[PDB]
Amino acid sequence: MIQEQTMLNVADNSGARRVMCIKVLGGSHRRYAGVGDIIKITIKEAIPRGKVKKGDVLKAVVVRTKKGVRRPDGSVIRFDGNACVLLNNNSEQPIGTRIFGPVTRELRSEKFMKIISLAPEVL
Amino acid sequence: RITHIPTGIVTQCQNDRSQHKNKDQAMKQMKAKLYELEMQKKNAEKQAMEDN
Amino acid sequence: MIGLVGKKVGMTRIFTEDGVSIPVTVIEVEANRVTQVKDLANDGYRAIQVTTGAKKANRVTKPEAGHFAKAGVEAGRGLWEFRLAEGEEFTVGQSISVELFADVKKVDVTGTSKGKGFAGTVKRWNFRTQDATHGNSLSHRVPGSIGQNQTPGKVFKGKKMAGQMGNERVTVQSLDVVRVDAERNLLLVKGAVPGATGSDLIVKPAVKA
Amino acid sequence: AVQQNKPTRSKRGMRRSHDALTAVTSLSVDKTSGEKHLRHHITADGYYRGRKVIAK
Amino acid sequence: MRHRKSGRQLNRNSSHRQAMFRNMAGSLVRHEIIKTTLPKAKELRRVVEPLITLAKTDSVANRRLAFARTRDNEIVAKLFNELGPRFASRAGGYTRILKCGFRAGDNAPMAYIELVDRSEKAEAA
Amino acid sequence: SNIIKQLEQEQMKQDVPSFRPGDTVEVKVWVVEGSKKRLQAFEGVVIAIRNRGLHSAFTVRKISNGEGVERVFQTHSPVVDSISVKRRGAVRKAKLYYLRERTGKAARIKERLN
RNA sequence: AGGACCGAACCGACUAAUGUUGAAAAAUUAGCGGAUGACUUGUGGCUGGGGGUGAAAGGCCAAUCAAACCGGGAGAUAGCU
RNA sequence: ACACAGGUGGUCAGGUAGAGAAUACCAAGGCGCUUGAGAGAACUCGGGUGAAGGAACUAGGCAAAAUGGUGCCGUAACUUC
RNA sequence: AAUUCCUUGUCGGGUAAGUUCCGACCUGCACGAAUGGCGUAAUGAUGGCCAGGCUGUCUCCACCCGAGACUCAGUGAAAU
RNA sequence: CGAUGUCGGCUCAUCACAUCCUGGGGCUGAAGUAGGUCCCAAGGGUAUGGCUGUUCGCCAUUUAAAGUGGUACGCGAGCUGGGUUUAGAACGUCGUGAGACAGUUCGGUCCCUAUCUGCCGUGGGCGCUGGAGAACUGAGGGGGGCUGCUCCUAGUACGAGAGGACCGGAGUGGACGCAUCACUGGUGUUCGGGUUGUCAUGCCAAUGGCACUGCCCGGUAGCUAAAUGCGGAAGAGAUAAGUGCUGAAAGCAUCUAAGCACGAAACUUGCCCCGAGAUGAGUUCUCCCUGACCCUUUAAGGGUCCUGAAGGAACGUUGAAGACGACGACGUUGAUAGGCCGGGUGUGUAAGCGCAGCGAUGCGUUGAGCUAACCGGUACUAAUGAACCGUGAGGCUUAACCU
Lengths: 123, 52, 209, 56, 125, 114
Fold this sequence. Notes:
This is part of a larger assembly, with chains A (123 residues), B (52 residues), C (209 residues), D (56 residues), E (125 residues) and F (114 residues).
Chain A: E1 7-10, E2 18-24, E3 38-43, E4 57-64, E5 69-70, E6 76-79, E7 83-87, H1 113-118
Parallel strand pairs in A: 1-7
Antiparallel strand pairs in A: 1-2, 2-3, 3-4, 4-7, 5-6
Chain B: H1 19-42
Chain F: H1 2-8, E1 24-31, E2 38-40, E3 43-50, E4 57-63, E5 68-74, E6 80-87
Antiparallel strand pairs in F: 1-2, 1-3, 1-6, 3-4, 4-5
The structure holds 4 RNA strands.
């Protein structure tokens, strides 16, 4: 349950380090992103050189949450920190070419098939 | 608050108590400020043509 | 179509083989003895009237007793009409059981919601609270304005206000049947139906899709 | 908040229609002592349904 | 709402409640019969009858466990050496509640709460 | 009721090991890697066991690619294939939620050894 | 050493909530400022109304102050109600 | 004006912890505050806890939360040193 | 600018977005030298702005503990 | 003028239509996609932040859309008090000065226990024509009515290409509502454990009190949302703008005069809820009462005796019912509550004794001990015989059958 003003860590290698959510996309009045949901973000910390600079606005996709995902049998996966992969604003492909940390099957789609390649672990 | 829809230039007045004074005052400043972007097209299409 | 009168035993779940957990209410539908039948001639509309369970002979009254004797049947914990489609026909004394939902895919369960008592506008109507601080003065959960002044100078009928909540007839529509079980007198519907454990439940087939 | 007219003595009575007490309908008599009492209560002289349950 | 909730608050707080029923239990085990308000008596059942049941088995752990819920050694003595024996056969239901009438001072419903076995030579002596 | 008590224990697995909190545990899990159906292991520490007959569950913390993951399992699901205790822990508590703050040398548990 | 620092008593009164026919005609609870000094406090004394006193707010002068209170001129006067 | 949660100068100073006349628990000694009894709705008052998020609240982080001790290490601009 | 009407002046900084803040410019409506000018370490229950921490302030409320509320007994006001 | 308290914000709304989205159409300087404009349409829907006291506005990022108005520019006996509008002080400026400025700047008490109307809920009385107990019908009233994206249809129609559909079907979202507690969680001062200070139980050991539940850690039942089920519909009727068919008046023409067909989230229904005080008080089933006597002003008249039904109320044990009433269960021919037994859950290996260690402590007995509201049993305790209210065949007129 990422919402406006939530700060997330960055799973990819893109340059960014912390980012802040600033909309949850795909609806009027929409409160939360969970896993596999697109959000508009801004970059706060960013490492000295790298694809993206502090203050850049772009999309991301949420890939890990503390609240957790739920699986059809009742099972929950929680993680220990909120996290996201930075995306282009228009194509909505990844910027990063590597991915740190585990991710989930909730991504497994047409759209984010590039990520679930690059992940170390899918749970 | 008058506004020109072609350009984007706006105006105000609110010194007065009467709305009708404020309107015809702010009409004056709106005349002047559209005369002023005849000078900044005129002067920047001299020094376009006069630079080359 | 008719349906049946059962009893919210409680909830549990059914793991499928492919993985999924289905949450189910369990409904005991021990069999519904018909007492009376109604007919366009005498009553002016077509309907049955059924009973279920057991009362104890002493705790029945004489005007009840005679009604049940007329039909043939042992007394039950109440009575319940159902209307009838074109062509459907039941004689008296004719124990309908949960085999009636054999072919059926969805149902429309109906009984009494739990009893919240006197409920305020936040709980009852989802009124959003006011500020907890920044100066608020004895007005944290109260409902704010209720009108205008003077036109119209009165509060409009059906204004949402505080007062009794729950303990009221309630339907839920289009619940998937998961299992029917003739031998144990059960019926397992997906999800959650009104009322407390022990409460009585009118289960019908879905009027909609 | 306060009244704009005196309420009548009519309305004052109408309000108090419901103020009246129901009398105790009838009294159990004990089988032993023959004393009268409240149902489900001991008697003035310590009996209840036969047996003396108080030393008084 | 109090759907399915035991206990009576009795217009006190939890530490006051706790200690009242400690005293009131003790008073009943000493005298075998007390006068008290109806609702207090009804909640004194759920404290006394568990001590009597505890003292059907003597041990040391039980004595100490009783002394943690009474804080009176005269009481645990009398529980273990006079009421464990008396109610050895009896399976629960050691206390009777009889209703008197109404306390003059404040018109409260009163009620005696005696023990069930009462041969009558253990309030004075 | 005895009606529900009987619908539950026609589903309960017979064959679940005893394990208690602190035990390191490998838990194998059917995943649909495609339309194929693989097992996937999940080793870590059992921090919490709910016991409720059929509804019984247990939480398992591991550190996976420099990142803490809990995963609650519903014991009697068919998704859980098997449960298998590597190492037996010796802890006083019923719930090791204090492991969430700790990492590394702090979050070591003593072995039970008996 | 100190119109030094932290901080009880003691002096004060910045914020909030309560109270607003009050527990109280100015308080209570939780925090707050000073706390060896241009500090604080007891007992007694002096200054009196266009007068007093005022690190000055027209502040204070017995719950009253851009002129106290009590009595008198006095049934002031009232083109107003 | 009240058998009023206010005001009122001086004196005495036990134990365990503690720097302490702070604070906690107690002794000597003194009290249970002159309406009670049930219930366990809304709402108000005074408290406790809170998934994910963390000032997005708001005129304003108001209020709440947090910080808090002793000893040792270590400590920037600026400076009237 | 505790001073600037026009004015949210223009430029730079800070924010995803800054009528406030900070640095400048000077076109000072209507600063200015003991009704003092410009500076200033320390001090401030002083005004404005930013950041970390922390949080039911909020997303969006939920549950719990006490005091009233409600019922019974006794006493028994008020504005109008 | 012997007072109608002001901008904005919060809470709660409600109507209009001059429609912002969704729905139906006509023209297009409409190939397609996408637009322009007009007509019909008020069912539902109709952002979050930065700056400012702001309304307004500008900017950022969304959305199907961020509509325009009315309601004392809706709403302070509902909240706030930033702005304005008292007393303090200061700057600029005007004035010789007291002072002043629709100039700016720091600070600055927001009372009311609801009588009547109204609204939300919940009862008592009477009535409905002998009395009682159930189940209904449905006059009327209320709730609900939102929409995105992806896939197929199809890279088909259209187009030189770029690009790229209608119509129809399938799946998965957002927002809103109803239910529920099986799951994930929250709470859980009534369950267990740890631990600081101190006081006590003669002392050791073990317990208890007080310190915000002293501080903490877990947590049963209940309640609950962030949790997970369900919902908006299809269809039918009569229409709007509009499109037509036959067709005269007017030898033709013409959607119209007679006649006929289509036609939208609007209308009436369909779905959910209330509902016979619907005084027009409806229907169906069952149950109960089958006695004398006397008087007056002789009638739906008054009284004495015997009789007291069905059922009701009251009392008690109580409830996933509850402010109180009410509603539901049970009252010995009894599981209504309490206890008790067994299980379950929670905590996490009690006390005691023994062993090891100089000691704190550790091990063994031991997954021990304790365990609330839970599940299943059990008459051990309390739900007393009775008394109380309620009667005795039910008016007249007329018809239709049956004697």
